[PDB]
Design a protein around this ligand. Structure first.
Ligand SMILES: CCCCCCCC/C=C\CCCCCCCC(=O)OC[C@@H](COP(=O)(O)OCC[N+](C)(C)C)OC(=O)CCCCCCC/C=C/CCCCCCCC
Ligand SMILES: CC(C)CCC[C@@H](C)[C@H]1CC[C@H]2[C@@H]3CC=C4C[C@@H](O)CC[C@]4(C)[C@H]3CC[C@]12C
Ligand SMILES: C[C@@H](NCCCc1cccc(C(F)(F)F)c1)c1cccc2ccccc12
Ligand SMILES: C[C@@H](NCCCc1cccc(C(F)(F)F)c1)c1cccc2ccccc12
Lengths: 284, 300
């Protein structure tokens, strides 16, 4: 209420709250995970480091490309896996900032597609028992990725995500969030991304004791185990964070598992190629 | 004055007369009804034993105790087999007791908080976990030393020989027993009834009092984890009956994964789910440790 001798107290418009002294109305506060909050710089810095590490790794393999160790594994599949890993860290960068209309649509499917692509390369490569029945590898990878591509599309037609501008959490504070369209599409996406990884993890367990390329199957099953542990834990963390930290939880989970696939499968061979040039068509 | 309009009372105020002319303020520890016609008592929220969530965390923390008891029974019945004696059968026993202490610490988060419970909540778990870590570390270094032997032994007395095996663990635990003692005397935790954050609900929680000790504890329990891996890295070339690397680097990775994934919910949310996630994290870490190391051998 503004002037003297007020018969009643006027309410305030929906886009404002009321000063401590109830004299006049001021502007509401909008909260969202921003690029200047101290807790997002760590995530931005962490990711950038992962991107640089992937760039360095693709460096050594396509530079020392005329060596037995790199030629022992398939070069094209390695390039595809490195490209997928480069997109996962960069994808996480898509989860920080002011949620726009199109970002809410590109949040999940980008990571889903990249992770399906990376998992499919490891599958086409686990001891060739999978490949014995039966170039063909590219066709199988394309078929694996196409079912995720298709599920994304039917979903974008039948219900795109968009901003919400919630006003039912804090009366004074406006919350900007994303409404995840429908739930069946998300459930199917998670189910497929987990079912593929389950098969990959099993054949590799099965072929864990074969010492081919410095026992690479064991590292693959280690990476798959790391991925499960990370995401079985995602359940309670997100289920109890209320506010602007759901994006933080998602970013943390994505970053962990991406490093999980990169490190396990690459760092041993990265060390071998860069130092100790003493293995040439003998231990490979 | 004979002509007037009727306006509803604001939140937290009621009336019970025909022509109120004023809204009566609700007394303390009470809140207005839905229709602002009669005050009713507020609600107190805490992790109680009536709700099934409480019945659950308890019915897990009995299963863990039973499993640990079963495991110690094998190491007592089969206490002379080559593979049981391969691992230290002294320090393996002491670890199992520390794991029993670990499962128990969680049961101090269920029920209405009190002064002694709030004071004993964190130090017990911290001491137990660091005890387990110290046991693992000292066992690993002994075998590397045994297997890094050029010329033969020279222990002068057999019994004191096994004194080192036990005193090193106490030396490691001494730093946190110190920090716990000075902390408790110079600013003990205490209960605190909070009703400011939400109007209709009274929250019963504890108060850390001094927070700087809660940083030093994490720094120490974590520093020790960085040592378990390094030693685990250093212990990769040993034979199979004595090897213990994969197990070490998975248990501590699980510990880090859980306690770094659970940071934002603890930082933001308030109430009963914080204690819930703390209990679930403690249980997850303790099972992880138990089945990573002892189960392969209990199968064999
Ligand atoms: C949502 C929650 C997120 C939380 C963040 C967690 C991030 C961590 C996850 C992933 C990134 C890296 C993971 C790599 C795992 C290593 C796999 C492993 O299990 O290793 C295998 C061992 C066993 O080999 P073997 O004896 O069977 O073979 C013997 C064969 N012969 C005889 C020829 C030698 O070999 C070895 O080298 C053992 C050496 C130990 C390796 C050290 C582990 C590296 C950890 C890095 C990050 C940890 C801190 C996280 C940051 C947060 C701080 C609070
Ligand atoms: C982000 C980074 C630093 C995390 C740690 C990754 C590095 C340091 C770890 C993760 C997996 C580890 C490897 C696990 C298994 C083996 C096989 C063994 O015969 C040689 C050591 C070697 C090759 C380890 C070297 C160190 C290693 C590559
Ligand atoms: C990033 C992550 N999606 C997290 C939101 C899940 C969710 C958020 C909100 C509600 C629901 C619910 F409705 F399903 F419960 C689920 C993701 C993306 C793509 C593939 C993935 C594969 C494995 C693991 C995670 C994947
Ligand atoms: C149980 C816990 N006391 C509360 C910390 C809350 C927390 C919630 C979420 C993340 C974190 C942390 F990871 F940052 F620590 C802390 C504790 C007490 C004493 C020693 C500990 C050693 C390791 C882990 C926890 C320890």
């Amino acid at each position: 209420s503004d002037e003297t001798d007020a018969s009643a107290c006027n309410k305030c418009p929906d886009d404002f709250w009321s000063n401590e002294n109830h004299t006049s109305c001021i502007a509401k506060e909008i909260e969202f995970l921003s690029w200047t909050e101290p807790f997002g710089i760590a995530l931005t810095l962490f990711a950038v480091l992962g991107i640089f590490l992937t760039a360095f790794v693709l460096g050594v393999f396509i530079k020392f490309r005329n060596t037995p160790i790199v030629k022992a594994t398939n070069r094209e599949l390695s390039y595809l896996l490195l490209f997928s890993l480069l997109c996962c860290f960069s994808s996480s960068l898509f989860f920080i900032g002011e949620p726009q209309d199109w970002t809410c649509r590109l949040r999940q499917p980008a990571f889903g597609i990249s992770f399906v692509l990376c998992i499919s390369c490891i599958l086409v490569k686990t001891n060739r028992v999978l490949l014995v029945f039966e170039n063909l590898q590219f066709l199988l990878v394309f078929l694996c990725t196409f079912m995720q591509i298709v599920i994304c599309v039917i979903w974008l037609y039948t219900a795109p995500p968009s901003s919400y501008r919630n006003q039912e959490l804090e009366d004074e504070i406006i919350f900007i969030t994303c409404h995840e369209g429908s739930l069946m599409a998300l459930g199917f996406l998670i189910g497929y991304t987990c079912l593929l990884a389950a098969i990959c993890f099993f054949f590799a367990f099965k072929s864990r004791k074969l010492p081919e390329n410095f026992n690479e199957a064991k590292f693959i099953t280690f990476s798959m185990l790391i991925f499960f542990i990370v995401w079985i834990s995602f359940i309670p963390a997100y289920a109890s964070t209320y506010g602007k930290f759901v994006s933080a939880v998602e970013v943390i989970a994505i970053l962990a598992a991406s490093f999980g696939l990169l490190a396990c499968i690459f760092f041993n061979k990265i060390y071998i190629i860069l130092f100790k040039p003493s293995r040439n068509t003998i231990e490979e | 004055t004979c002509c007037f309009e009727c306006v509803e009372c604001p939140d937290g105020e009621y009336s019970d007369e025909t022509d109120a002319s004023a809204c009566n303020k609700c007394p303390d520890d009470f809140w207005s009804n839905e229709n602002h016609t009669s005050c009713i008592a507020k609600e107190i929220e805490f992790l109680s034993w009536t709700e099934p969530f409480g019945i659950a965390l308890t019915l897990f923390a009995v299963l863990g105790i039973f499993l640990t008891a079963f495991v110690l029974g094998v190491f007592i019945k089969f206490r002379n087999t080559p593979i049981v004696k391969a691992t230290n059968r002294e320090l393996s026993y002491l670890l199992l007791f520390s794991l029993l202490c670990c499962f128990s610490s969680s049961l101090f988060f269920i029920g209405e908080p009190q002064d002694w419970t709030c004071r004993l909540r964190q130090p017990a778990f911290g001491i137990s976990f660091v005890l387990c870590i110290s046991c693992i570390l000292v066992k690993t270094n002994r075998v590397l030393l045994v297997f890094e032997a050029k010329i033969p032994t020279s222990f002068h007395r057999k019994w004191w020989g096994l004194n080192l095996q036990f005193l090193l663990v106490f030396l490691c635990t001494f730093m946190q027993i110190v920090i716990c003692v000075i902390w408790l005397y110079t600013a003990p935790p205490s209960s605190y009834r909070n009703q400011e954050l939400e109007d209709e609900i009274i929250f019963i929680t504890c108060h850390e009092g001094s927070l700087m000790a809660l940083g030093f504890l994490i720094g120490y329990t974590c520093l020790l984890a960085a040592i378990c891996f390094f030693f685990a890295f250093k212990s990769r070339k040993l034979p199979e009956n004595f090897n213990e690397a994969k197990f070490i680097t998975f248990s501590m990775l699980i510990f880090f994964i859980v306690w770094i994934s659970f940071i934002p919910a603890y930082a933001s949310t308030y109430g009963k789910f914080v204690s819930a996630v703390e209990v679930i994290a403690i249980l997850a870490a303790s099972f992880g440790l138990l089945a990573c190391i002892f189960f392969n051998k209990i199968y064999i």
